[PDB]
């Protein structure tokens, strides 16, 4: 499951910053697509504007940390967020 | 070069070995040797940090001053006495503190041609 520790609002960048924890007891660390498509539900966010940066899988723990973005427009993320993470999320080929 | 740096000898006397090469910021420059001529010939010199300084290699006119504070631009005939050296007065060399003979008479130079580029003096 996913539980949000924090949501904050970079108004100078017009973006939501989300710290959360993922419960995965006995089951491998989830793929990026599933966590994105499942976090997209409960904050009412557009998939394209949302980007997930890091999902840290802890040693000897069933809780993995997770940290992600949520922008407000297509242009801002291209302008600011660098290409590599867009490729990791698939937003750029 | 002209190197204005450490004396090779200690105050007591022990000779001092050098441990590094000279530095361009530490070297000096040639002597101006300002002389009496029919015209003013001057050289501007770029200096440390991009500054400038003009240098009289030949001097023809002088700014003499009365004790009241009124100045006269005049010509310079010949130098009377150079306390800095005995060779200088013989060779019409112009230096601060020298006693000079102009049309007005006796003047004492109160300016350095080497750095100022003009020669000022006081009528005596």
């Amino acid at each position: 499951e996913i539980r949000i520790k924090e949501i904050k609002e970079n108004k100078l960048i017009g973006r939501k910053e989300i710290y959360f924890e993922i419960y995965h007891p006995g089951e491998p660390t989830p793929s990026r697509k599933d966590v994105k498509g499942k976090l997209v539900a409960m904050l009412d966010l557009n998939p394209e504007t949302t980007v997930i940066q890091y999902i840290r899988s802890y040693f000897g723990s069933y809780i993995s940390k997770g940290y992600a973005k949520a922008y407000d427009s297509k242009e801002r993320m291209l302008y600011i967020e660098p290409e590599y993470i867009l490729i990791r999320d698939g937003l750029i080929e | 070069a002209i190197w204005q740096g450490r004396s090779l000898k200690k105050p007591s006397g022990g000779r001092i070995v050098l441990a590094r090469k000279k530095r361009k910021r530490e070297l000096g420059r040639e002597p101006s040797n300002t002389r009496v001529a029919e015209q003013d010939k001057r050289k501007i010199i770029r200096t440390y940090g991009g500054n400038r300084k003009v240098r009289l290699t030949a001097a023809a006119y002088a700014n003499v001053f009365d004790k009241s504070g009124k100045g006269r631009k005049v010509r310079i005939i010949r130098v009377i006495e150079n306390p800095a050296n005995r060779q200088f007065a013989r060779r019409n060399i112009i230096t601060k503190g020298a006693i000079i003979e102009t049309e007005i008479g006796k003047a004492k130079v109160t300016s350095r041609p080497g750095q100022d580029g003009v020669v000022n003096a006081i009528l005596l």
Binding site: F59, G60, S61 | -
Partner: protein, 173 residues
């Protein structure tokens, strides 16, 4: 800058007294290396070093450091809550050996043998405070002593793992 070893070798490796005493000790606790005993003696000795420096120490920093020392000693489960600096010298190596994670888990009845507890710890079948630890040399605080529990994913967590039957019979037996 080089990081120092955390233990102090004995000043003489063949005193019969000390050698046999250490032998009895590692027989009791089934440690893998005398290096381990030496490390435990080292932190014992440094506790005492702090105690002795502080007992003669005067000054506000001295008092604060002293209270820090007492508090940490209590938190480790090595002293009573009314402990006073004077008694800390009387602390023995065995006081710390009991507080070892491996000795605690064997003392919880969860193991038939000290080495079996070791095998569980390395194999991760034990969890503490919801986080797994693979080191049998870890020193346990008092506050965690109640949370020492089987790791969830561990096959031993279920009450049907055949080894766990023998574990239970040893506990009651």
């Amino acid at each position: 800058k080089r990081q120092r070893k955390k233990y102090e070798t004995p000043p003489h490796p063949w005193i019969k007294e000390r050698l046999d005493r250490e032998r009895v000790l590692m027989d009791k606790y089934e440690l893998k290396n005398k290096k381990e005993l030496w490390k435990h003696e080292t932190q014992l000795k440094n506790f005492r070093r702090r105690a002795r420096r502080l007992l003669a120490a005067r000054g506000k920093q001295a008092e604060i450091e002293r209270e820090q020392l007492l508090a940490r000693l209590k938190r480790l489960g090595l002293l009573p809550e009314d402990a006073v600096l004077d008694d800390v010298l009387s602390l023995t190596i065995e006081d710390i050996l009991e507080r070892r994670l491996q000795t605690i888990v064997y003392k919880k009845g969860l193991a038939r043998t000290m080495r079996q507890a070791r095998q569980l710890i390395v194999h991760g079948h034990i969890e503490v405070n919801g986080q797994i630890i693979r080191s049998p040399s870890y020193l346990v605080l008092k506050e965690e002593e109640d949370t020492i529990t089987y790791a969830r994913t561990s096959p031993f967590a279920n009450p049907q793992h055949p080894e766990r039957m023998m574990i239970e019979k040893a506990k009651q037996g």
